[PDB]
């Protein structure tokens, strides 16, 4: 069930933030007992309907998070940013991000919470990959829109963001932007991404 | 130990939390069952060190959101503010807030995580509870400093906040005013409270 898969994220971040607290050496002997053998128990589960435990700890982050968002009880309310609140990028323009746009031969993938979009009929061309996205520090957190962009501007390619879980990370969007750059290379074509991407995504 | 009681806050925090989420249902039949046994296992475990468990909860609640608070682990960081962020309501100029003041006859009680302090011997005056605080809605969430206040302007008496887990609430600030004017009623005196107070307070 779906809600088995929900459980197992909480448990697993719920997990985590045990560990975290035995990491202050906090817990007492009993407690590091539960925690030993729910790992244990937890790598079992994850085995078992196979799904690896770094991201089933990151939804259940968003999905504890999303509680600890609703109360109200008073204060049980929690206030949390640890936030270097951040800078936004912009390469495009919004005349461009809003453009009309469709694939002759369309190729669409899923991956780390992210569409990827392509045109499979689009050869010896010159596209520029534009993103609008996020950062802190030099890192990347978030993308709001990247679009694939030929010689004469035009929409060969777009990786957006998906609302499941977990969301979708730096690293995500590295791999997704891979998949996308070697894909339209496959048939002919060169991936030039912009200064900002280059100097932020990888 | 003090990792027995800070262990046992968590767990009740962190159980909170779950019960919130099998309160949107989302829990599969075997997690249901680890939130009642393990809700069993709780009520044994605080009727023994003898504590009961509104509190352990909140505590628990201050524990993990520091936990929470600090990572960094990329994202597994959270932000939260359910906040309706907060006014503030200051009775006390700060030429009254630092003041010298003493006791002839020191009276020292802590509740609800606050020093109460009082003059024992202090008669037949007319005292004003001055407090600066802060406010959501009509109800305090919070005490910053009280003093009472003579006739002439002089501390008779204080209430501050304390460092400890958990921290105090408006309800421990309305006991926390209960005590320090019954006491002070008792030994002849007639103590007025702020309207600011009034009109929060209680």
Request: hydrophobic content about 40%.
């Amino acid at each position: 069930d779906s809600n088995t898969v929900s459980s197992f994220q909480v448990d697993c971040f719920l997990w985590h933030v045990r560990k975290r607290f035995a990491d202050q050496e906090l817990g007492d002997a009993p407690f590091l007992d539960r925690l030993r053998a729910d790992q244990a128990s937890l790598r079992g589960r994850g085995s078992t309907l196979g799904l690896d435990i770094e991201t089933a700890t990151r939804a259940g982050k968003q999905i504890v998070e999303r509680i600890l968002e609703e109360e109200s009880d008073e204060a049980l309310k929690m206030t949390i940013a640890s936030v270097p609140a951040s800078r936004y990028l912009t390469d495009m323009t919004l005349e461009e991000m809003s453009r009309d746009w469709f694939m002759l031969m369309p190729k669409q993938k899923v991956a780390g919470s992210l569409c990827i979009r392509m045109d499979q009929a689009i050869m010896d061309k010159n596209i520029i990959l534009k993103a609008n996205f996020s950062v802190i520090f030099d890192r990347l957190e978030t993308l709001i829109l990247l679009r694939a962009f030929t010689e004469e501007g035009a929409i060969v390619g777009e990786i957006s963001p998906l609302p499941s879980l977990p969301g979708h990370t730096d690293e995500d969007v590295k791999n997704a932007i891979g998949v996308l750059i070697g894909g339209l290379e496959w048939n002919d074509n060169t991936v030039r991404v912009s200064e900002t991407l280059q100097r932020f995504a990888w």
